[PDB]
Ligand binder design. Structure first.
Ligand SMILES: NC(=O)C1=CN([C@@H]2O[C@H](COP(=O)(O)OP(=O)(O)OC[C@H]3O[C@@H](n4cnc5c(N)ncnc54)[C@H](OP(=O)(O)O)[C@@H]3O)[C@@H](O)[C@H]2O)C=CC1
Ligand SMILES: COc1cc(Cc2cnc(N)nc2N)c2c(c1OC)O[C@@H](C1CC1)C=C2
Length: 158
């Protein structure tokens, strides 16, 4: 199973200066629940943003750099390697990966951040005429999660 996993704001911002624009623990907890025990596929810049492989799952980085060899990371070098990997693979970012994979994945786990952030990287446009809402669940606000957000699970129609 091939999934996108992504947080994006009302204008589909995903990124600013190689970090997330928002502070939102609940969504990182969401990511953790989903991807633990499974595989993340991520491009190099995104990996460099996370810095270390995420515990307790397979971390796969897509890069052209054949020097690349990082303890705890699998390297692949073309998009097409993605479809080898076994099990539930989450496409994990960034803009270039989402743009490359969005027409190819079975389904997407999106967190809509109900906010307008300044960004420099974006999730590509998509339509609900294409994507059916398997679930929509409001995140809870609290001291430490103070931006409204909705967990969507969307499945390619038809
Ligand atoms: N909100 C969210 O859910 C998430 C947001 N982000 C954000 O996304 C942004 C990063 O996106 P972006 O800047 O596009 O970078 P990416 O993380 O998508 O990585 C870009 C790099 O990935 C590698 N790559 C991509 N496609 C290929 C390919 N087909 N073959 C070989 N290598 C490939 C290249 O690495 P190289 O040049 O080394 O060869 C390329 O430079 C950041 O701002 C980050 O904060 C990231 C993940 C999640
Ligand atoms: C671009 O930066 C990040 C992207 C991401 C990617 C990411 C974040 N949020 C969502 N919903 N999907 C994603 N694909 C993460 C992330 C990032 O910064 C550390 O942090 C980690 C937390 C510490 C364990 C997890 C994810």
């Amino acid at each position: 199973t091939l999934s996108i996993l992504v947080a994006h704001d009302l204008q589909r911002v995903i990124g600013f200066e190689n970090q997330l624009p928002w502070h939102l623990p609940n969504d990182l907890k969401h990511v953790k629940k989903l991807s633990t025990g499974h595989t993340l596929v991520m491009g190099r810049k995104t990996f460099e943003s996370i810095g270390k492989p995420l515990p307790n799952r397979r971390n796969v980085v897509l890069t052209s750099d054949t020097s690349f060899n990082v303890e705890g990371v699998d390297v692949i070098h073309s998009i097409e390697d993605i479809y080898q990997l076994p099990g539930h693979v989450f496409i994990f970012g960034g803009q270039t990966l989402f743009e490359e994979m969005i027409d190819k994945v079975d389904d997407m786990y999106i967190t809509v951040i109900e906010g307008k952030f300044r960004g420099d990287t974006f999730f590509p446009p998509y339509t609900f005429e294409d994507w059916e809402v398997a679930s929509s669940v409001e995140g809870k606000l609290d001291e430490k999660n103070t931006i409204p957000h909705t967990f969507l699970h969307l499945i390619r129609k038809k």
